[PDB]
Structures are given as structure tokens and as C-alpha cells.
Design an enzyme around this catalytic site. Sequence first.
Site, PDB file in Angstrom:
ATOM      1  N   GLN B  94      -7.117  -9.767  -7.842  1.00 18.70           N
ATOM      2  CA  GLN B  94      -7.186  -9.490  -6.430  1.00 18.70           C
ATOM      3  C   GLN B  94      -5.794  -9.736  -5.920  1.00 18.70           C
ATOM      4  O   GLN B  94      -5.149 -10.747  -6.254  1.00 18.70           O
ATOM      5  CB  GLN B  94      -8.111 -10.440  -5.707  1.00 18.70           C
ATOM      6  CG  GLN B  94      -8.233 -10.149  -4.223  1.00 18.70           C
ATOM      7  CD  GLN B  94      -9.134 -11.094  -3.459  1.00 18.70           C
ATOM      8  OE1 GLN B  94      -9.745 -12.047  -3.972  1.00 18.70           O
ATOM      9  NE2 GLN B  94      -9.238 -10.797  -2.178  1.00 18.70           N
ATOM     10  N   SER B  95      -5.309  -8.830  -5.100  1.00 17.85           N
ATOM     11  CA  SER B  95      -4.075  -9.260  -4.341  1.00 17.85           C
ATOM     12  C   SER B  95      -3.892  -9.056  -2.816  1.00 17.85           C
ATOM     13  O   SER B  95      -2.978  -9.598  -2.282  1.00 17.85           O
ATOM     14  CB  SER B  95      -2.785  -8.925  -5.113  1.00 17.85           C
ATOM     15  OG  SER B  95      -1.780  -9.885  -4.731  1.00 17.85           O
ATOM     16  N   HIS B 100     -12.601  -6.135  -0.311  1.00 16.36           N
ATOM     17  CA  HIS B 100     -12.573  -4.615  -0.432  1.00 16.36           C
ATOM     18  C   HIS B 100     -13.293  -4.202  -1.720  1.00 16.36           C
ATOM     19  O   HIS B 100     -13.245  -4.891  -2.717  1.00 16.36           O
ATOM     20  CB  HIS B 100     -11.171  -4.052  -0.477  1.00 16.36           C
ATOM     21  CG  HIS B 100     -10.261  -4.718  -1.475  1.00 16.36           C
ATOM     22  ND1 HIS B 100      -9.715  -5.976  -1.278  1.00 16.36           N
ATOM     23  CD2 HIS B 100      -9.683  -4.253  -2.607  1.00 16.36           C
ATOM     24  CE1 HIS B 100      -8.884  -6.280  -2.273  1.00 16.36           C
ATOM     25  NE2 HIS B 100      -8.860  -5.254  -3.100  1.00 16.36           N
ATOM     26  N   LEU B 101     -13.980  -3.100  -1.604  1.00 14.26           N
ATOM     27  CA  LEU B 101     -14.648  -2.515  -2.624  1.00 14.26           C
ATOM     28  C   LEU B 101     -13.832  -1.268  -3.112  1.00 14.26           C
ATOM     29  O   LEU B 101     -13.650  -0.383  -2.265  1.00 14.26           O
ATOM     30  CB  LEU B 101     -15.923  -2.035  -2.091  1.00 14.26           C
ATOM     31  CG  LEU B 101     -16.827  -1.352  -3.105  1.00 14.26           C
ATOM     32  CD1 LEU B 101     -17.477  -2.401  -4.005  1.00 14.26           C
ATOM     33  CD2 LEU B 101     -17.991  -0.636  -2.474  1.00 14.26           C
ATOM     34  N   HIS B 102     -13.412  -1.172  -4.425  1.00 12.72           N
ATOM     35  CA  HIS B 102     -12.857   0.080  -4.954  1.00 12.72           C
ATOM     36  C   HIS B 102     -13.903   0.948  -5.367  1.00 12.72           C
ATOM     37  O   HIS B 102     -14.913   0.476  -6.011  1.00 12.72           O
ATOM     38  CB  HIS B 102     -12.031  -0.171  -6.102  1.00 12.72           C
ATOM     39  CG  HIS B 102     -10.906  -1.121  -5.861  1.00 12.72           C
ATOM     40  ND1 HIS B 102      -9.627  -0.703  -5.716  1.00 12.72           N
ATOM     41  CD2 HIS B 102     -10.841  -2.467  -5.879  1.00 12.72           C
ATOM     42  CE1 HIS B 102      -8.812  -1.739  -5.672  1.00 12.72           C
ATOM     43  NE2 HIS B 102      -9.532  -2.830  -5.720  1.00 12.72           N
TER      44      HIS B 102
HETATM   45  N1  LIG Z   1      -0.989   0.627   2.843  1.00  8.49           N
HETATM   46  C1  LIG Z   1      -2.007   0.975   2.007  1.00  8.49           C
HETATM   47  N2  LIG Z   1      -2.805   2.066   2.216  1.00  8.49           N
HETATM   48  C2  LIG Z   1      -3.815   2.388   1.361  1.00  8.49           C
HETATM   49  N3  LIG Z   1      -4.093   1.652   0.246  1.00  8.49           N
HETATM   50  C3  LIG Z   1      -3.372   0.532  -0.058  1.00  8.49           C
HETATM   51  C4  LIG Z   1      -2.271   0.126   0.824  1.00  8.49           C
HETATM   52  N4  LIG Z   1      -1.726  -0.994   0.304  1.00  8.49           N
HETATM   53  C5  LIG Z   1      -2.416  -1.291  -0.826  1.00  8.49           C
HETATM   54  N5  LIG Z   1      -3.400  -0.387  -1.021  1.00  8.49           N
HETATM   55  C6  LIG Z   1      -4.327  -0.332  -2.171  1.00  8.49           C
HETATM   56  O1  LIG Z   1      -5.078  -1.512  -2.421  1.00  8.49           O
HETATM   57  C7  LIG Z   1      -5.347  -1.544  -3.834  1.00  8.49           C
HETATM   58  C8  LIG Z   1      -5.332  -2.899  -4.465  1.00  8.49           C
HETATM   59  C9  LIG Z   1      -5.865  -3.972  -3.552  1.00  8.49           C
HETATM   60  O2  LIG Z   1      -4.699  -4.696  -3.239  1.00  8.49           O
HETATM   61  P1  LIG Z   1      -3.954  -5.502  -4.402  1.00  8.49           P
HETATM   62  O3  LIG Z   1      -4.065  -6.831  -3.863  1.00  8.49           O
HETATM   63  S1  LIG Z   1      -5.082  -5.653  -6.149  1.00  8.49           S
HETATM   64  O4  LIG Z   1      -2.421  -4.977  -4.557  1.00  8.49           O
HETATM   65  C10 LIG Z   1      -1.724  -4.191  -3.571  1.00  8.49           C
HETATM   66  C11 LIG Z   1      -0.774  -5.013  -2.682  1.00  8.49           C
HETATM   67  O5  LIG Z   1       0.187  -4.148  -2.073  1.00  8.49           O
HETATM   68  C12 LIG Z   1      -0.023  -6.034  -3.517  1.00  8.49           C
HETATM   69  O6  LIG Z   1       1.108  -6.625  -2.867  1.00  8.49           O
HETATM   70  P2  LIG Z   1       2.415  -7.004  -3.755  1.00  8.49           P
HETATM   71  O7  LIG Z   1       2.344  -6.395  -5.070  1.00  8.49           O
HETATM   72  S2  LIG Z   1       2.787  -8.999  -4.184  1.00  8.49           S
HETATM   73  O8  LIG Z   1       3.698  -6.363  -3.036  1.00  8.49           O
HETATM   74  C13 LIG Z   1       4.999  -6.976  -3.030  1.00  8.49           C
HETATM   75  C14 LIG Z   1       5.546  -6.891  -1.612  1.00  8.49           C
HETATM   76  O9  LIG Z   1       5.684  -5.504  -1.264  1.00  8.49           O
HETATM   77  C15 LIG Z   1       5.142  -5.322   0.035  1.00  8.49           C
HETATM   78  N6  LIG Z   1       4.639  -3.960   0.291  1.00  8.49           N
HETATM   79  C16 LIG Z   1       3.505  -3.395  -0.174  1.00  8.49           C
HETATM   80  N7  LIG Z   1       3.380  -2.132   0.317  1.00  8.49           N
HETATM   81  C17 LIG Z   1       4.452  -1.890   1.103  1.00  8.49           C
HETATM   82  C18 LIG Z   1       4.940  -0.763   1.922  1.00  8.49           C
HETATM   83  N8  LIG Z   1       4.212   0.375   1.965  1.00  8.49           N
HETATM   84  N9  LIG Z   1       6.105  -0.909   2.610  1.00  8.49           N
HETATM   85  C19 LIG Z   1       6.824  -2.052   2.552  1.00  8.49           C
HETATM   86  N10 LIG Z   1       6.437  -3.127   1.824  1.00  8.49           N
HETATM   87  C20 LIG Z   1       5.285  -3.100   1.089  1.00  8.49           C
HETATM   88  C21 LIG Z   1       4.067  -6.399   0.217  1.00  8.49           C
HETATM   89  O10 LIG Z   1       3.873  -6.730   1.599  1.00  8.49           O
HETATM   90  C22 LIG Z   1       4.605  -7.565  -0.599  1.00  8.49           C
HETATM   91  O11 LIG Z   1       5.277  -8.546   0.207  1.00  8.49           O
HETATM   92  C23 LIG Z   1      -4.262  -0.791  -4.572  1.00  8.49           C
HETATM   93  O12 LIG Z   1      -4.941   0.042  -5.499  1.00  8.49           O
HETATM   94  C24 LIG Z   1      -3.500  -0.111  -3.465  1.00  8.49           C
HETATM   95  O13 LIG Z   1      -3.285   1.247  -3.840  1.00  8.49           O
END
Ligand SMILES: Nc1ncnc2c1ncn2[C@@H]1O[C@H](CCO[P@@](=O)(S)OC[C@H](O)CO[P@](=O)(S)OC[C@H]2O[C@@H](n3cnc4c(N)ncnc43)[C@H](O)[C@@H]2O)[C@@H](O)[C@H]1O
Lengths: 112, 114
Positions: B94-95, B100-102
Site C-alpha cells: 500500500q502506498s 482504495h479498491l483496484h
Molecule cells: N494522481 C493520480 N491519478 C490517478 N491514479 C493515481 C494517481 N496517483 C496514484 N495513482 C494510482 O494509485 C495506484 C497505487 C495506489 O497508490 P500507491 O500507494 S500502491 O503508489 C502511488 C503513489 O504515487 C506512491 O507515491 P511515491 O511512490 S513514495 O511517490 C514519490 C513522490 O512523488 C510524488 N508524486 C506522485 N505523483 C506525482 C505527480 N503526478 N506530480 C508530482 N509529484 C508526484 C509523491 O507525492 C511522492 O512524494 C497506482 O497504481 C497509481 O497509478
Amino acid sequence: GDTIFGKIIRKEIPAKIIFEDDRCLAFHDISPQAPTHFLVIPKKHISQISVAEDDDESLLGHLMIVGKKCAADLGLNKGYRMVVNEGSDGGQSVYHVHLHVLGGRQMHWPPG
Amino acid sequence: PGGDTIFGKIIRKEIPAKIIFEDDRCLAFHDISPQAPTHFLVIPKKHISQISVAEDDDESLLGHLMIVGKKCAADLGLNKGYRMVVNEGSDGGQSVYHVHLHVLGGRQMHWPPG
Ligand SMILES: Nc1ncnc2c1ncn2[C@@H]1O[C@H](CCO[P@@](=O)(S)OC[C@H](O)CO[P@](=O)(S)OC[C@H]2O[C@@H](n3cnc4c(N)ncnc43)[C@H](O)[C@@H]2O)[C@@H](O)[C@H]1O
């Protein structure tokens, strides 16, 4: 038509039961994919999630709350994953709705 | 209206998403990094950080997320099948800390599910 999960419910074949109530049953999966792996099923015969109706909503919810409670009683405090599969693309084996719950190791992405 | 995560911003319409369905309890939309030809999320408008802290009266709501998931699956053409997944905590991968449900389909899904 009837399934193996029906027999498990009727106590006609053995399973290691984790939890039971009037509307659902939880038990250990016989082919585990993780150090802990169990199922929660409803006693009511819904063959698959696609044919569940809007009044089944409380019952499906109940399966998940039971799942996460059994997860906590089984020591899964680092996490777990729940899955429901539908139809042949989703890899559904038994045609009686059921919720998998897995943990005890790192789960990977994508989830199949 | 939805919490201090990215999902909250989606719920408040502060950043875009391709919305499939919306009602008073929940929001479904397309996953931005799809792992299948069709891949979406159903989330509750209420902020529950993760399934492990959901309470007994959330039961109807978690239910609703699945019923939406499967309605949306059917409207999106997924008649050969699909898979629903909820992840909890780091072992579950989970992150985003908003439940949320996939929902995935459009190809053969594999076992084990990660
Ligand atoms: N904006 C969105 N719209 C639709 N779907 C989204 C979405 N953001 C995530 N999802 C979906 O949730 C699903 C997973 C459920 O969430 P998870 O927790 S398992 O992982 C996704 C999340 O983004 C993880 O964060 P992280 O990997 S530690 O990101 C590193 C840094 O990048 C940043 N970041 C992420 N997206 C963006 C972005 N679009 N622009 C700028 N910064 C960003 C984030 O805030 C963080 O500080 C994924 O399949 C993903 O495609």
C-alpha cells in the site's frame, strides 16, 4: 449448482476454520500462496461478484471486515492483500464468491 | 472533504482524473499507471487511511465500493473477467494512505496475485 465451498460450509469436508458467524466463514486456503493465506466466504450462494446485487452490499462489506479482523488475530501486522477474482480472466476457480487474504511476506506489483 | 493525500485532491477536484462514476459515498477513476488494459480505482469519500483501521459501521461502505467496482467493470466491457484488490500496509504494497479498491481486467490475470 454446488461447489466445494458449499461442502465446506455444510461441514461435509474438513477445513481449518478461523472464524464463523451466521453469514460468513473464514478458513485456511488449501493451496497457500503466502505464509498466511485464507478465505472468507459468505454462506449465501452468490456464484460470483458480477451477479451480486445492491442489497448484498452489507454482506460483501462484512467479508472484508472479517478479513481484516482475522488478519489481525493471525499476527499480520506488516500488512496483507485482499483479492477477489471474477470469471476466467480474473482467474476465478470456484464459482462461489470468496475473498482471499494473503500476507506473511512481501507482495509484489502487479497483482497477477 | 477527503484527507491530506493525493486522493483527497482528486475528491475535491483539485487535480484531474478520468472519472468513471461518482456518488455520495465514493468515486471511481482510471489508474494513472495501469497494470492492465483496463485498470481503475474505487475509493470512499470518507477518509479511512487503510483497511486495518476501518470500523464495523464502515461495512456497508466497503461493500459499496465493491458493488461500484463491479458495476463499472460491467459498463467498461469486462465481461471475460477481472480482479479486485485491496492492499494494506507495506507488505501489501500500500502506498497512498486512503483506502482504495483496484479493479483490473482486459487480459489474463495470473496466480499468485503478487
Ligand atoms: N494522481 C493520480 N491519478 C490517478 N491514479 C493515481 C494517481 N496517483 C496514484 N495513482 C494510482 O494509485 C495506484 C497505487 C495506489 O497508490 P500507491 O500507494 S500502491 O503508489 C502511488 C503513489 O504515487 C506512491 O507515491 P511515491 O511512490 S513514495 O511517490 C514519490 C513522490 O512523488 C510524488 N508524486 C506522485 N505523483 C506525482 C505527480 N503526478 N506530480 C508530482 N509529484 C508526484 C509523491 O507525492 C511522492 O512524494 C497506482 O497504481 C497509481 O497509478
